[PDB]
Amino acid sequence: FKEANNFLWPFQLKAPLGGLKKKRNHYVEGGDAGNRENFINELIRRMN
Protein backbone atom coordinates (compact mmCIF):
# COMPACT_ATOMS: atom_id res chain seq x y z
CA PHE A 1 0.00 0.00 0.00
CA LYS A 2 2.77 2.46 0.89
CA GLU A 3 4.33 2.33 -2.57
CA ALA A 4 1.00 2.13 -4.41
CA ASN A 5 -0.50 5.04 -2.46
CA ASN A 6 2.61 7.22 -2.68
CA PHE A 7 2.69 6.53 -6.43
CA LEU A 8 -0.66 8.33 -6.70
CA TRP A 9 -0.32 12.09 -7.00
CA PRO A 10 -2.63 13.87 -4.51
CA PHE A 11 -6.04 14.16 -6.13
CA GLN A 12 -6.91 17.65 -7.40
CA LEU A 13 -10.63 17.74 -6.67
CA LYS A 14 -13.01 20.52 -7.67
CA ALA A 15 -15.14 22.71 -5.45
CA PRO A 16 -18.11 20.65 -4.23
CA LEU A 17 -21.21 20.81 -6.40
CA GLY A 18 -23.85 22.12 -4.01
CA GLY A 19 -21.32 23.71 -1.66
CA LEU A 20 -20.47 23.09 1.97
CA LYS A 21 -22.52 23.67 5.11
CA LYS A 22 -20.00 25.39 7.40
CA LYS A 23 -16.27 24.74 7.10
CA ARG A 24 -15.67 26.41 10.48
CA ASN A 25 -17.62 23.81 12.51
CA HIS A 26 -17.16 20.09 13.03
CA TYR A 27 -19.33 17.70 11.04
CA VAL A 28 -20.93 16.60 14.33
CA GLU A 29 -22.06 20.18 15.02
CA GLY A 30 -23.57 20.43 11.54
CA GLY A 31 -20.39 21.69 9.87
CA ASP A 32 -18.00 20.03 7.45
CA ALA A 33 -14.76 19.33 9.36
CA GLY A 34 -13.65 16.07 10.92
CA ASN A 35 -14.63 12.43 10.51
CA ARG A 36 -17.89 11.83 8.63
CA GLU A 37 -17.29 8.05 8.29
CA ASN A 38 -19.25 6.63 5.32
CA PHE A 39 -20.68 10.06 4.44
CA ILE A 40 -17.35 10.99 2.85
CA ASN A 41 -18.61 9.08 -0.19
CA GLU A 42 -21.51 11.51 -0.60
CA LEU A 43 -19.00 14.37 -0.61
CA ILE A 44 -16.70 12.53 -3.04
CA ARG A 45 -19.52 12.33 -5.60
CA ARG A 46 -20.01 16.11 -5.50
CA MET A 47 -16.27 16.89 -5.65
CA ASN A 48 -15.08 14.38 -8.28
Binding site: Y27, V28, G30, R36, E37
Partner: protein, 177 residues
Protein backbone atom coordinates in the same frame (compact mmCIF):
# COMPACT_ATOMS: atom_id res chain seq x y z
CA UNK B 1 -40.45 9.76 4.30
CA UNK B 2 -37.78 12.28 5.33
CA UNK B 3 -37.23 13.48 8.89
CA UNK B 4 -34.88 16.14 10.22
CA UNK B 5 -34.27 14.01 13.33
CA UNK B 6 -33.87 10.23 13.51
CA UNK B 7 -34.11 7.94 16.54
CA UNK B 8 -31.34 5.40 17.11
CA UNK B 9 -30.51 2.70 19.61
CA UNK B 10 -26.76 2.84 20.27
CA UNK B 11 -25.11 -0.06 22.12
CA UNK B 12 -21.58 0.14 23.48
CA UNK B 13 -19.29 -0.99 26.26
CA UNK B 14 -15.88 -0.41 27.78
CA UNK B 15 -13.01 -2.27 26.16
CA UNK B 16 -12.51 -5.73 27.74
CA UNK B 17 -9.69 -5.86 30.28
CA UNK B 18 -8.00 -8.49 32.42
CA UNK B 19 -9.97 -7.41 35.49
CA UNK B 20 -13.25 -7.30 33.53
CA UNK B 21 -13.35 -9.53 30.45
CA UNK B 22 -17.13 -8.94 30.10
CA UNK B 23 -17.80 -5.28 30.92
CA UNK B 24 -21.37 -4.07 31.22
CA UNK B 25 -23.15 -3.31 27.95
CA UNK B 26 -24.98 0.03 27.85
CA UNK B 27 -27.79 1.06 25.50
CA UNK B 28 -29.31 4.47 24.78
CA UNK B 29 -32.13 5.81 22.63
CA UNK B 30 -30.72 8.97 21.05
CA UNK B 31 -32.05 11.52 18.56
CA UNK B 32 -29.74 12.87 15.87
CA UNK B 33 -29.76 13.98 12.24
CA UNK B 34 -27.76 10.90 11.16
CA UNK B 35 -25.82 7.90 12.46
CA UNK B 36 -22.48 9.70 12.83
CA UNK B 37 -23.92 12.36 15.13
CA UNK B 38 -25.90 9.76 17.08
CA UNK B 39 -22.67 7.92 17.91
CA UNK B 40 -20.96 11.13 19.03
CA UNK B 41 -23.74 11.95 21.49
CA UNK B 42 -23.73 8.35 22.76
CA UNK B 43 -20.11 8.67 23.88
CA UNK B 44 -20.88 12.07 25.41
CA UNK B 45 -23.32 10.52 27.88
CA UNK B 46 -21.25 7.39 28.50
CA UNK B 47 -18.24 9.60 29.24
CA UNK B 48 -20.18 11.79 31.67
CA UNK B 49 -22.61 9.19 33.11
CA UNK B 50 -20.63 5.92 33.14
CA UNK B 51 -17.06 7.28 32.94
CA UNK B 52 -16.39 5.38 29.70
CA UNK B 53 -14.71 7.47 27.01
CA UNK B 54 -14.69 6.50 23.34
CA UNK B 55 -10.91 6.07 23.44
CA UNK B 56 -11.41 3.23 25.95
CA UNK B 57 -14.84 2.14 24.72
CA UNK B 58 -16.29 -0.13 22.05
CA UNK B 59 -19.23 0.48 19.71
CA UNK B 60 -21.36 -2.66 19.36
CA UNK B 61 -24.59 -1.87 17.49
CA UNK B 62 -26.47 1.12 16.07
CA UNK B 63 -30.00 0.77 14.69
CA UNK B 64 -32.57 3.36 13.65
CA UNK B 65 -36.05 3.15 15.19
CA UNK B 66 -39.03 3.82 12.91
CA UNK B 67 -42.60 4.67 13.85
CA UNK B 68 -44.79 1.57 13.88
CA UNK B 69 -48.00 3.23 12.62
CA UNK B 70 -46.98 6.34 10.62
CA UNK B 71 -50.56 6.80 9.32
CA UNK B 72 -52.37 7.30 12.65
CA UNK B 73 -52.20 10.22 15.09
CA UNK B 74 -50.59 9.74 18.51
CA UNK B 75 -50.03 12.05 21.47
CA UNK B 76 -46.36 12.25 22.46
CA UNK B 77 -44.99 13.44 25.78
CA UNK B 78 -41.35 14.52 25.98
CA UNK B 79 -39.47 15.03 29.25
CA UNK B 80 -36.41 17.18 28.65
CA UNK B 81 -33.66 19.12 30.38
CA UNK B 82 -32.37 22.36 28.87
CA UNK B 83 -29.95 25.17 29.69
CA UNK B 84 -31.16 28.76 29.80
CA UNK B 85 -28.97 31.87 29.96
CA UNK B 86 -28.84 31.55 33.77
CA UNK B 87 -29.04 27.83 34.60
CA UNK B 88 -30.68 24.48 33.93
CA UNK B 89 -34.36 23.55 34.00
CA UNK B 90 -36.68 20.58 33.51
CA UNK B 91 -39.91 20.72 31.53
CA UNK B 92 -42.54 18.39 30.10
CA UNK B 93 -44.04 18.98 26.65
CA UNK B 94 -46.80 17.29 24.65
CA UNK B 95 -47.28 17.12 20.89
CA UNK B 96 -49.60 15.51 18.35
CA UNK B 97 -48.00 13.95 15.28
CA UNK B 98 -48.14 10.87 13.09
CA UNK B 99 -44.58 9.88 14.07
CA UNK B 100 -42.43 10.56 17.11
CA UNK B 101 -39.83 12.00 14.72
CA UNK B 102 -42.22 14.82 13.85
CA UNK B 103 -43.06 15.41 17.51
CA UNK B 104 -39.36 15.69 18.37
CA UNK B 105 -38.92 18.13 15.48
CA UNK B 106 -41.77 20.23 16.90
CA UNK B 107 -40.13 20.18 20.34
CA UNK B 108 -36.84 21.56 19.01
CA UNK B 109 -38.68 24.23 17.01
CA UNK B 110 -40.79 25.25 20.01
CA UNK B 111 -37.81 25.41 22.38
CA UNK B 112 -35.99 27.65 19.90
CA UNK B 113 -39.02 29.93 19.60
CA UNK B 114 -40.34 30.25 23.16
CA UNK B 115 -37.00 29.99 24.99
CA UNK B 116 -34.19 30.79 22.50
CA UNK B 117 -32.67 27.40 23.35
CA UNK B 118 -30.35 26.01 20.69
CA UNK B 119 -30.29 22.31 19.84
CA UNK B 120 -27.06 21.50 21.69
CA UNK B 121 -28.49 22.92 24.96
CA UNK B 122 -31.25 20.28 25.19
CA UNK B 123 -31.15 16.77 26.65
CA UNK B 124 -34.13 14.47 26.09
CA UNK B 125 -34.83 12.51 29.27
CA UNK B 126 -37.87 10.48 28.24
CA UNK B 127 -40.38 10.05 25.43
CA UNK B 128 -43.66 8.15 25.40
CA UNK B 129 -46.97 7.75 23.60
CA UNK B 130 -49.57 9.25 25.94
CA UNK B 131 -53.19 8.08 25.62
CA UNK B 132 -55.72 10.85 25.07
CA UNK B 133 -57.21 10.52 28.56
CA UNK B 134 -53.79 10.90 30.24
CA UNK B 135 -52.69 14.07 28.45
CA UNK B 136 -51.97 17.16 30.55
CA UNK B 137 -51.52 20.09 28.14
CA UNK B 138 -54.64 21.89 26.95
CA UNK B 139 -53.09 22.49 23.52
CA UNK B 140 -53.44 18.73 23.04
CA UNK B 141 -56.75 18.19 24.85
CA UNK B 142 -58.79 20.59 22.72
CA UNK B 143 -58.26 18.35 19.67
CA UNK B 144 -59.59 15.29 21.55
CA UNK B 145 -63.07 15.85 20.14
CA UNK B 146 -65.04 13.39 18.01
CA UNK B 147 -66.94 16.36 16.52
CA UNK B 148 -63.89 18.55 15.86
CA UNK B 149 -65.11 21.44 13.72
CA UNK B 150 -63.67 24.84 12.82
CA UNK B 151 -63.11 27.04 9.75
CA UNK B 152 -59.86 28.15 8.13
CA UNK B 153 -59.65 31.68 9.52
CA UNK B 154 -56.32 32.43 7.79
CA UNK B 155 -55.65 31.29 4.23
CA UNK B 156 -52.56 31.62 2.05
CA UNK B 157 -53.41 33.06 -1.37
CA UNK B 158 -51.02 31.92 -4.09
CA UNK B 159 -51.03 30.21 -7.50
CA UNK B 160 -50.53 26.43 -7.50
CA UNK B 161 -47.08 27.06 -8.98
CA UNK B 162 -44.97 30.06 -9.88
CA UNK B 163 -45.81 29.38 -13.54
CA UNK B 164 -49.15 31.13 -12.94
CA UNK B 165 -47.58 34.06 -11.06
CA UNK B 166 -48.15 37.54 -12.50
CA UNK B 167 -47.16 40.88 -11.00
CA UNK B 168 -50.42 42.55 -12.07
CA UNK B 169 -53.99 41.29 -11.82
CA UNK B 170 -57.27 42.87 -12.86
CA UNK B 171 -59.06 42.26 -9.54
CA UNK B 172 -58.24 41.68 -5.89
CA UNK B 173 -58.40 38.21 -4.32
CA UNK B 174 -61.90 37.03 -3.42
CA UNK B 175 -61.72 35.31 -0.03
CA UNK B 176 -64.45 33.87 2.18
CA UNK B 177 -64.51 31.28 4.95
Amino acid sequence: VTYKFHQYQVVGRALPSENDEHPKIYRMKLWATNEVRAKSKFWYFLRKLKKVKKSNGQMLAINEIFEKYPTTIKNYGIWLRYQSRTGYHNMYKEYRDTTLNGAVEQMYTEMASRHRVRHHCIQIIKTATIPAKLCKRESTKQFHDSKIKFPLVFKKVRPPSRKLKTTYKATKPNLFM
